[PDB]
Design an enzyme around this catalytic site. Structure first.
Site, PDB file in Angstrom:
ATOM      1  N   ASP A  39       0.707  -1.045  -0.056  1.00 40.96           N
ATOM      2  CA  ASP A  39      -0.100  -0.212  -0.094  1.00 40.96           C
ATOM      3  C   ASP A  39       0.712   1.233   0.014  1.00 40.96           C
ATOM      4  O   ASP A  39       1.923   1.272  -0.518  1.00 40.96           O
ATOM      5  CB  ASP A  39      -0.901  -0.163   1.030  1.00 40.96           C
ATOM      6  N   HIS A  69      -3.649   6.105   3.946  1.00 39.92           N
ATOM      7  CA  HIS A  69      -4.344   4.762   3.504  1.00 39.92           C
ATOM      8  C   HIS A  69      -3.776   3.586   3.837  1.00 39.92           C
ATOM      9  O   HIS A  69      -4.402   2.780   4.403  1.00 39.92           O
ATOM     10  CB  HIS A  69      -4.271   5.001   1.964  1.00 39.92           C
ATOM     11  N   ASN A 161     -14.048  -0.047  -6.021  1.00 40.50           N
ATOM     12  CA  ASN A 161     -15.143   0.736  -5.511  1.00 40.50           C
ATOM     13  C   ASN A 161     -15.802   1.404  -6.660  1.00 40.50           C
ATOM     14  O   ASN A 161     -16.131   2.377  -6.925  1.00 40.50           O
ATOM     15  CB  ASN A 161     -14.371   1.902  -4.775  1.00 40.50           C
ATOM     16  N   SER A 224     -11.028  -1.050   0.057  1.00 43.67           N
ATOM     17  CA  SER A 224      -9.856  -1.071   0.780  1.00 43.67           C
ATOM     18  C   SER A 224      -9.821  -1.417   2.059  1.00 43.67           C
ATOM     19  O   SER A 224      -8.985  -1.759   2.678  1.00 43.67           O
ATOM     20  CB  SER A 224      -8.921   0.023   0.405  1.00 43.67           C
TER      21      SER A 224
END
Ligand SMILES: [Ca+2]
Ligand SMILES: [Ca+2]
Length: 279
Positions: A39, A69, A161, A224
């Site tokens: 990530d 994130h 998403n 996520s």
């Protein structure tokens, strides 16, 4: 063990029903397992990680998570307060820049890195990788995720998403990994969650509280956020000896809460990650 007033998602993965507040989990808590969070990095100094997080690779100038994130996702895997697997070891691989973006070549390299690096770590209960990322379909990204899984790592990836079929996104569309959709606290598919035949499982993904950079916390939403719930659950179950990296996705699906979700299109699994904990 029981964590009172837990984030809704943790409560949800230890209940057959929505709306509870306590996260029930075996105190082994993923001890002896390892999770790579691929990530934007992990702010390993965050007190919530209790020294159990470390950066192991960056593809950018720094290993710092300048975005948040990755730290959030890592906290859902394994932070004290926000994590599924509260005693797991977290390893950060920074494939995404501080804007949250990364080239596919870098993301692939980061997957290959984990497949090798794990051989240098003491992870007696096994190894998981959490990929809260994705873009358009790429056979090379899918193949990298498949290699990582084949190497002996439980790979969990975000469905995406786009409120669309995950078949058009990668690594979501790689069959051999564990592709995770998002649900909300009312057991609806999250409004943004991708769906489709390639989804293996859903986890909590709407309004998920976890760690953030600057030693902070925040609630954000996404596939996520669902992915690290599943990654953490896999680590937890592997520590309990109930499953292995190769079989954890199927075990999670087999032991999930079935049919609890709404707005699941025909052809998409209706399975929500569940730890089946019994005191
Ligand atoms: Ca139920
Ligand atoms: Ca799969």
């Amino acid at each position: 063990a029981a964590q009172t007033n837990a984030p809704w998602g943790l409560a949800r993965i230890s209940s057959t029903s929505p709306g509870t507040s306590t996260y029930y989990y075996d105190e082994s808590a993923g001890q002896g397992s390892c999770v790579y969070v691929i990530d934007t990095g992990i702010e390993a100094s965050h007190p919530e990680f209790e020294g159990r997080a470390q950066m192991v690779k960056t593809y950018y100038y720094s290993s710092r998570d300048g975005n948040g994130h990755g730290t959030h996702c890592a906290g859902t895997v394994g932070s004290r307060t926000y994590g599924v697997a509260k005693k797991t070891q977290l390893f950060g691989v920074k494939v995404l820049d501080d804007n949250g973006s990364g080239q596919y070549s870098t993301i692939i390299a980061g997957m290959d890195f984990v497949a090798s690096d794990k051989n240098n770590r003491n992870c007696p209960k096994g190894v998981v990788a959490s990929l809260s990322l994705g873009g358009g379909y790429s056979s090379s990204v899918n193949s990298a995720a498949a290699r990582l899984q084949s190497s002996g790592v439980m790979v969990a990836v975000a469905a995406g998403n786009n409120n669309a079929d995950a078949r058009n996104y990668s690594p979501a569309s790689e069959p051999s990994v564990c592709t995770v959709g998002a649900s909300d606290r009312y057991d609806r598919r999250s409004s943004f969650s991708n769906y489709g035949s390639v989804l293996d499982i859903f986890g909590p993904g709407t309004d998920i509280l976890s760690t953030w950079i600057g030693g902070s916390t925040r609630s954000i939403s996404g596939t996520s956020m669902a992915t690290p719930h599943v990654a953490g659950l896999a680590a937890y179950l592997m520590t309990l000896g109930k499953t292995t990296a190769a079989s954890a996705c199927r075990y999670i699906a087999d032991t999930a809460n079935k049919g609890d979700l709404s707005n699941i299109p025909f052809g998409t699994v209706n399975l929500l990650a569940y730890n089946n904990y019994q005191a």
